[PDB]
């Protein structure tokens, strides 16, 4: 009885202090002021709210203080609007990330600042509507006859919250489907990036291997197909985008065409000498643009893997409780000790968010 009270005082305090710290770190640091970090602020605000109202609710229910039926329903539904706000904000982060990787330039111009405020308003609007649905006649007064006239009872989760709603509407439609979509999105990002890290490595490897095939060659037959592999590689690597990036590739393809003309005339030594002018373009441009592109995708992959750990720890926190609630609706018995850990773990997600930002993002521990 007092185990739960001080464990939720701990969870609550850590969540409030940590997430207001996260809000401060985002606000002070000017580099962490993108749309993704705006949704991180949204998640942090919802997390603060979860802590602010877990603190009274735990002891209130534990002491069995008789509040009004609708008041206890309000408390629980408020907890659900913040919880679903967290899920919807995570979905917003996932959609933002997917758009950023898929649409390198289009996403930025399309998503205006006002449009991001529109998206955030839509996000919390959806959360408000979904979470407050029990208060809109989906409560125990709807179908249960005994629970339709009860007033000023002890606030308990079984007494006020429709477990039918929890298993089917809350979990399957709103917890399960967005996490499935989000996980698919993250795996798609982890596939697109590793394909973009492979082909950029593959276009660089053929631009390095065929440079060495040319330097050990005897006839123009094995030189002509060597530049044919480069010219396919340099045309493919040109489509990886401001105008200085594609200007250096026009020199590189043009210098290949300068040495294809010499290789077509049978000049095996003028083509090799003109292929040595590719290395001047390779060190001046292709060293600079590929390593900037490789570090940008590696930063994008490490940012996505950091945000995926938020989803995994979300899925480690509410899927256990969901399975516990599943048994309840299917008329099975759940032990008290098993259940108590389940609710704590569901609220442990509030405390896990700030620490993950500190260990993964290097701009959070310094502030």
């Amino acid at each position, epitope marked *: 009885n007092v185990t739960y009270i001080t464990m939720e005082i701990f969870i609550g305090l850590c969540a409030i202090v940590g997430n207001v710290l996260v809000i401060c770190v985002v606000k002070l640091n000017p580099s962490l002021q993108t749309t993704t970090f705006y949704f991180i602020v949204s998640l942090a605000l919802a997390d603060i709210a979860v802590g602010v109202l877990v603190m009274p609710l735990a002891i209130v229910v534990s002491l069995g203080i008789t509040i009004h039926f609708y008041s206890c329903l309000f408390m629980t539904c408020l907890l659900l609007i913040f919880t679903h706000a967290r899920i919807m904000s995570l979905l917003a982060i996932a959609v933002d990330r997917y758009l950023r990787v898929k649409l390198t330039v289009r996403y930025k111009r399309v998503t205006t600042h006002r449009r991001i405020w529109l998206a955030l308003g839509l996000c919390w609007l959806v959360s408000f509507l979904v979470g407050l649905t029990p208060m809109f006649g989906w409560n125990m007064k709807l179908t249960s006859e005994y629970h339709r006239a009860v007033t000023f009872l002890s606030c308990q989760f079984v007494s006020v919250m429709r477990m039918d709603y929890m298993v089917y509407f809350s979990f399957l439609t709103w917890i399960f489907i967005p996490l499935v979509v989000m996980c698919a999105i993250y795996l798609d990002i982890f596939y697109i990036i590793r394909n973009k890290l492979a082909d950029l490595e593959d276009n660089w490897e053929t631009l390095n291997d065929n440079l060495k095939v040319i330097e050990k060659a005897d006839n123009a037959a094995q030189v002509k197909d060597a530049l044919t*592999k480069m010219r*396919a590689a340099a045309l493919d690597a040109q489509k990886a985008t401001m105008k200085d990036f594609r200007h250096g590739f026009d020199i590189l393809v043009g210098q290949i065409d300068d040495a294809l003309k010499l290789a077509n005339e049978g000049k095996v030594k003028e083509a090799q000498a003109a292929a040595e002018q590719l290395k001047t373009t390779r060190n001046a441009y292709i060293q600079k643009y590929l390593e900037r592109a490789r570090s940008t995708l590696q930063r994008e992959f490490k940012t996505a893997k950091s945000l995926f750990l938020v989803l995994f720890l979300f899925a480690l926190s509410w899927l256990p409780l969901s399975i516990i609630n599943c048994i309840i609706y299917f008329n099975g018995e759940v032990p008290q000790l098993v259940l108590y850990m389940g609710i704590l773990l569901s609220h442990a997600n509030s405390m896990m968010n700030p620490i993950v930002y500190a260990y993964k993002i290097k701009k959070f521990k310094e502030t």
Partner: antibody, heavy 124, light 109 residues
């Protein structure tokens, strides 16, 4: 209007000679590379030759290498395909097509405008 | 040296059908793949260049796509004026031009 007109295609003996004239009208031959593509009757298209009159660069297919010579006149705005030692499988409809220079979108539009084609009949 | 193996050599379809012509390159030619339409007795006309970009004046029902070394021409809403022969050309260099074998599109009945 940009157009290509072929001429000089007719009836020749095997081992004979022929010259085809691809008269460009709406553009200049030093700005666009001119190519010859032939189509045998009942068969598909086959690339034959290539002239780049800005740089003088010529290239030929391996079936026509050493026997077909290409040239271009900047003043007459005309590319010439001179045929030597014609044989039976050179009987085709020869199309003249233009292709832009690197870099940009003129290069990516390969053979955007074609000539109407001329028929070369090699037969004894 | 670079082969463009066009997968369909005979293709029967009616008006309004969605057709797909697959051209496979022997090695990498990047995006430099063009598509042409040749009516009988006439010169070929460019439809798709760069393997996705529609040429000006071509109707919007033609479309292109690239999947590695695989290139695909698609006509979503086929018309009676679309019954011709369709060739795929790779154009990686001036001297390395090779055409496909041609896909005749004829009327199904």
């Amino acid at each position: 209007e940009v157009q290509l007109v072929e001429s000089g295609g007719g009836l020749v003996q095997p081992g004979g000679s022929l010259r085809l004239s691809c008269a460009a009208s709406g553009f200049n031959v030093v700005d666009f590379s001119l190519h010859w593509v032939r189509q045998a009757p009942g068969k598909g298209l086959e690339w034959v030759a290539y002239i780049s009159s800005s740089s003088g660069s010529t290239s030929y297919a391996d079936s026509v290498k050493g026997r077909f010579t290409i040239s271009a006149d900047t003043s007459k705005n005309t590319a010439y395909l001179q045929m030597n030692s014609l044989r039976a499988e050179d009987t085709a409809v020869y199309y003249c097509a233009r292709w832009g220079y690197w870099p940009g979108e003129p290069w990516w539009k390969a053979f955007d405008y074609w000539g109407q084609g001329t028929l070369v009949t090699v037969s004894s | 040296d670079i082969q463009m193996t066009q997968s369909p050599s005979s293709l029967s379809a009616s008006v309004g059908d969605r057709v797909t012509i697959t051209c496979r390159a022997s090695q990498s030619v990047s995006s430099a793949v063009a598509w042409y339409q040749q009516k009988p007795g006439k010169a070929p006309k460019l439809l798709i260049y760069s393997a996705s970009s529609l040429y000006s004046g071509v109707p919007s029902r033609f479309s292109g796509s690239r999947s590695g070394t695989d290139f695909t021409l698609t006509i979503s809403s086929l018309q009676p004026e679309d019954f011709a022969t369709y060739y795929c050309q790779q154009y990686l260099y001036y001297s390395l031009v090779t055409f496909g074998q041609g896909t005749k599109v004829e009327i199904k009945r």
